[PDB]
Design a protein around this motif. Structure first.
Motif, mmCIF file in Angstrom:
data_model
loop_
_atom_site.group_PDB
_atom_site.id
_atom_site.type_symbol
_atom_site.label_atom_id
_atom_site.label_comp_id
_atom_site.label_asym_id
_atom_site.label_seq_id
_atom_site.Cartn_x
_atom_site.Cartn_y
_atom_site.Cartn_z
ATOM 1 N N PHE A 115 0.858 -1.163 0.000
ATOM 2 C CA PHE A 115 0.000 0.000 0.000
ATOM 3 C C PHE A 115 0.899 1.219 0.000
ATOM 4 C CE2 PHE A 115 0.450 -0.831 4.555
ATOM 5 C CZ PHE A 115 0.613 0.414 5.105
ATOM 6 N N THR A 116 0.355 2.357 -0.426
ATOM 7 C CA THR A 116 1.136 3.582 -0.489
ATOM 8 C C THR A 116 0.399 4.702 0.228
ATOM 9 O OG1 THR A 116 0.270 4.306 -2.662
ATOM 10 C CG2 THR A 116 2.164 2.875 -2.677
ATOM 11 N N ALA A 117 1.184 5.562 0.876
ATOM 12 C CA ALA A 117 0.692 6.770 1.530
ATOM 13 C C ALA A 117 1.232 7.978 0.795
ATOM 14 C CB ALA A 117 1.131 6.821 2.979
ATOM 15 N N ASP A 118 0.319 8.847 0.376
ATOM 16 C CA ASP A 118 0.660 10.073 -0.334
ATOM 17 C C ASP A 118 -0.116 11.193 0.349
ATOM 18 O OD1 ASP A 118 0.141 11.087 -3.824
ATOM 19 O OD2 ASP A 118 1.253 12.074 -2.196
ATOM 20 N N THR A 121 2.571 7.898 -11.549
ATOM 21 C CA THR A 121 2.371 9.322 -11.850
ATOM 22 C C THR A 121 2.361 10.188 -10.587
ATOM 23 O OG1 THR A 121 -0.076 9.450 -11.745
ATOM 24 C CG2 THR A 121 0.901 8.659 -13.830
ATOM 25 N N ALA A 122 2.448 9.556 -9.420
ATOM 26 C CA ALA A 122 2.258 10.264 -8.161
ATOM 27 C C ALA A 122 3.558 10.740 -7.507
ATOM 28 C CB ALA A 122 1.500 9.379 -7.209
ATOM 29 N N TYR A 123 4.699 10.498 -8.142
ATOM 30 C CA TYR A 123 5.968 10.898 -7.557
ATOM 31 C C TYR A 123 6.920 11.291 -8.662
ATOM 32 C CZ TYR A 123 7.177 6.091 -8.815
ATOM 33 O OH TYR A 123 7.345 4.902 -9.492
ATOM 34 N N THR A 124 7.998 11.966 -8.287
ATOM 35 C CA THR A 124 9.032 12.365 -9.226
ATOM 36 C C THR A 124 10.263 11.503 -8.990
ATOM 37 O OG1 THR A 124 9.908 14.050 -7.724
ATOM 38 C CG2 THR A 124 8.197 14.761 -9.282
ATOM 39 N N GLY A 160 6.607 10.737 11.613
ATOM 40 C CA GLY A 160 5.190 10.997 11.502
ATOM 41 C C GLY A 160 4.842 11.819 10.275
ATOM 42 N N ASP A 161 3.646 12.394 10.284
ATOM 43 C CA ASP A 161 3.095 13.022 9.094
ATOM 44 C C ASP A 161 3.971 14.149 8.549
ATOM 45 O OD1 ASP A 161 0.873 11.305 9.326
ATOM 46 O OD2 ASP A 161 -0.316 12.816 10.397
ATOM 47 N N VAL A 162 4.585 14.930 9.429
ATOM 48 C CA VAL A 162 5.490 15.997 8.996
ATOM 49 C C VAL A 162 6.525 15.496 7.989
ATOM 50 C CG1 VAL A 162 7.373 17.486 9.806
ATOM 51 C CG2 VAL A 162 5.185 17.545 10.927
ATOM 52 N N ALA A 163 7.119 14.340 8.274
ATOM 53 C CA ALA A 163 8.073 13.731 7.357
ATOM 54 C C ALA A 163 7.389 13.041 6.191
ATOM 55 C CB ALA A 163 8.942 12.733 8.090
ATOM 56 N N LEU A 164 6.398 12.213 6.488
ATOM 57 C CA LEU A 164 5.824 11.377 5.443
ATOM 58 C C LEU A 164 5.134 12.191 4.352
ATOM 59 C CD1 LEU A 164 4.411 8.413 7.528
ATOM 60 C CD2 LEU A 164 6.685 8.678 6.570
ATOM 61 N N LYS A 165 4.537 13.328 4.705
ATOM 62 C CA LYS A 165 3.796 14.104 3.712
ATOM 63 C C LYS A 165 4.728 14.782 2.714
ATOM 64 C CE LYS A 165 2.165 17.039 6.922
ATOM 65 N NZ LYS A 165 1.460 18.272 7.475
ATOM 66 N N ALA A 166 6.025 14.818 3.019
ATOM 67 C CA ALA A 166 7.020 15.298 2.055
ATOM 68 C C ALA A 166 7.404 14.251 0.993
ATOM 69 C CB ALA A 166 8.264 15.776 2.788
ATOM 70 N N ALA A 167 6.844 13.050 1.099
ATOM 71 C CA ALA A 167 7.247 11.941 0.240
ATOM 72 C C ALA A 167 6.047 11.157 -0.262
ATOM 73 C CB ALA A 167 8.156 11.004 1.011
ATOM 74 N N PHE A 168 6.289 10.373 -1.306
ATOM 75 C CA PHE A 168 5.414 9.282 -1.692
ATOM 76 C C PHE A 168 6.032 8.049 -1.029
ATOM 77 C CE2 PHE A 168 4.448 5.745 -4.519
ATOM 78 C CZ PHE A 168 3.106 5.903 -4.763
ATOM 79 N N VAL A 169 5.262 7.350 -0.198
ATOM 80 C CA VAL A 169 5.790 6.285 0.647
ATOM 81 C C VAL A 169 5.137 4.955 0.316
ATOM 82 C CG1 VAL A 169 6.345 5.598 2.999
ATOM 83 C CG2 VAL A 169 6.141 8.012 2.441
ATOM 84 N N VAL A 170 5.975 3.970 0.014
ATOM 85 C CA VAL A 170 5.537 2.613 -0.298
ATOM 86 C C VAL A 170 5.761 1.722 0.908
ATOM 87 C CG1 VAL A 170 5.815 0.596 -1.805
ATOM 88 C CG2 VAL A 170 6.158 2.911 -2.705
ATOM 89 N N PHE A 171 4.680 1.107 1.373
ATOM 90 C CA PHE A 171 4.716 0.116 2.438
ATOM 91 C C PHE A 171 4.624 -1.238 1.739
ATOM 92 C CE2 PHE A 171 4.291 2.807 6.205
ATOM 93 C CZ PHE A 171 3.947 4.006 5.616
ATOM 94 N N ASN A 172 5.781 -1.876 1.560
ATOM 95 C CA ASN A 172 5.867 -3.120 0.807
ATOM 96 C C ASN A 172 5.767 -4.304 1.755
ATOM 97 O OD1 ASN A 172 6.497 -5.266 -0.891
ATOM 98 N ND2 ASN A 172 8.698 -4.900 -0.698
ATOM 99 N N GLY A 173 4.624 -4.981 1.696
ATOM 100 C CA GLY A 173 4.333 -6.121 2.548
ATOM 101 C C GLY A 173 4.624 -7.468 1.927
ATOM 102 N N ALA A 174 5.630 -7.514 1.066
ATOM 103 C CA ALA A 174 6.150 -8.775 0.568
ATOM 104 C C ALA A 174 6.716 -9.607 1.724
ATOM 105 C CB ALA A 174 7.215 -8.516 -0.470
ATOM 106 N N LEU A 214 10.394 -0.532 2.895
ATOM 107 C CA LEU A 214 9.763 0.770 2.733
ATOM 108 C C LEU A 214 10.420 1.496 1.582
ATOM 109 C CD1 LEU A 214 9.606 2.307 6.310
ATOM 110 C CD2 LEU A 214 7.656 2.079 4.761
ATOM 111 N N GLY A 215 9.619 2.173 0.768
ATOM 112 C CA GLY A 215 10.145 2.991 -0.300
ATOM 113 C C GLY A 215 9.744 4.445 -0.127
ATOM 114 N N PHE A 216 10.663 5.349 -0.449
ATOM 115 C CA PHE A 216 10.388 6.779 -0.429
ATOM 116 C C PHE A 216 10.794 7.418 -1.737
ATOM 117 C CE2 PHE A 216 9.729 7.687 4.129
ATOM 118 C CZ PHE A 216 10.201 6.524 4.700
ATOM 119 N N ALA A 217 9.916 8.260 -2.269
ATOM 120 C CA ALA A 217 10.219 9.102 -3.416
ATOM 121 C C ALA A 217 9.829 10.532 -3.101
ATOM 122 C CB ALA A 217 9.467 8.632 -4.651
ATOM 123 N N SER A 218 10.522 11.471 -3.727
ATOM 124 C CA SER A 218 10.071 12.856 -3.728
ATOM 125 C C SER A 218 8.827 12.987 -4.610
ATOM 126 C CB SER A 218 11.192 13.762 -4.217
ATOM 127 O OG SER A 218 12.296 13.734 -3.318
#
Length: 330
Positions: A157-160, A177-180, A306-320, A325-329
């Protein structure tokens, strides 16, 4: 399968985010706080002590044809901010953004603490940490993600999260399309039940990057960024007039300040939190002292992205099988 749901700040400070969730048949839509730092899906309900309900939408299991009491099961949870809730358990159909789980444990609150009562905008929590933290007794229950996983196109799942704006939780796919740029993935330890990872360091404003390992959790249910006292002191030292106030409960700064950005490392990559994201406004209405969004984790016992950090990124929660965890700008 996949799901996609919009998540919306509850107030002008982004104190938390709510996401609509359909429970039961016919659907009862409740606005839940998706929390990657806990593992219980609990709701205000027809069973919640009446004096502890103040404006929330409630789940009424007797009105759902698919609800079934999970006989003998109870739950009780306490969060890092001192809030708590408890009650009994139903199974029912739960859908998020078009993704449906049947037989999901829906934890019905009999009691909630004052902070929950006082927040009319949050109808409950949807936990997205590892199911080993779930509090249902005597039979521990799985999270919505854990239940959905096998059906998902990809076990992610991803948090944006938005800054002063809506964002998105996606299940089962990565929206390219949601990250650079590229997504940088980093190792996760599940030993404490959290999405726990190690940042490779930080920078303050335009300062040089300090390489240093910072172990912490990716926690969508925590508003602020909690880091070691050394790091936090280095940040606030760059803001004239900033100080730690024991009376207020953390670092405050003059509302006339322009805050520097804060960068954190993800492997060799860098996520930049703009200074404005670190402003949580007047400590009380009309005050010229403003509350900071980066605070010390000393005495929490864990660092919290927390949200202050996470909202600066597109975050992938990889439950393989081996989570990452993945982070993109963005």
């Amino acid at each position: 399968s996949t799901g996609s749901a919009t998540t919306t700040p509850i107030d002008s400070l982004d104190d938390a985010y709510i996401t609509p969730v359909q429970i039961g048949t016919p659907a009862q839509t409740l606005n839940l706080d998706f929390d990657t730092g806990s593992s219980d899906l609990w709701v205000f309900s027809s069973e919640t002590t009446a004096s502890e309900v103040d404006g929330q939408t409630i789940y009424t299991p007797s009105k759902s044809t698919t609800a079934k009491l999970l006989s003998g099961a109870t739950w009780s949870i306490s969060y890092g901010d001192g809030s708590s809730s408890s009650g009994d358990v139903y199974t029912d159909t739960v859908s998020v953004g078009g993704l449906t789980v049947t037989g999901q444990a829906v934890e019905s609150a009999k009691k909630v603490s004052s902070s929950f009562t006082e927040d009319s905008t949050i109808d409950g929590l949807l936990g997205l940490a590892f199911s080993t933290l779930n509090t249902v007794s005597p039979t521990q229950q799985k999270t919505f993600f854990d239940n959905a996983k096998a059906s998902l196109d990809s076990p992610v799942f991803t948090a944006d999260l938005g800054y002063h704006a809506p964002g998105t939780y996606n299940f089962g796919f990565i929206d390219t399309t949601a990250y650079t740029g590229s997504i940088t993935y980093t190792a996760v330890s599940t030993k404490q039940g959290f999405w726990e990872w190690t940042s490779t360091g930080y920078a303050v404003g335009s300062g040089t990057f300090k390489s240093t390992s910072i172990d912490g959790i990716a926690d969508t249910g925590t508003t602020l960024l909690y880091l070691p006292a050394t790091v936090v002191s280095a940040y606030w030292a760059q803001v004239s007039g900033a100080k730690s106030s024991s009376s207020v409960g953390g670092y405050v700064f003059p509302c006339s300040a322009t805050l520097p950005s804060f960068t954190f490392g993800v492997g060799s990559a860098r996520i930049v939190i703009p200074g404005d994201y670190i402003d949580f406004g007047p400590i009380s209405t009309g005050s010229s002292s403003c509350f900071g969004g980066i605070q010390s984790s000393a005495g929490i016992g864990i660092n919290i992205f927390g949200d202050v950090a996470l909202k600066a990124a597109f975050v992938v929660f990889n439950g393989a099988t081996t989570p990452t965890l993945g982070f993109a700008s963005k």
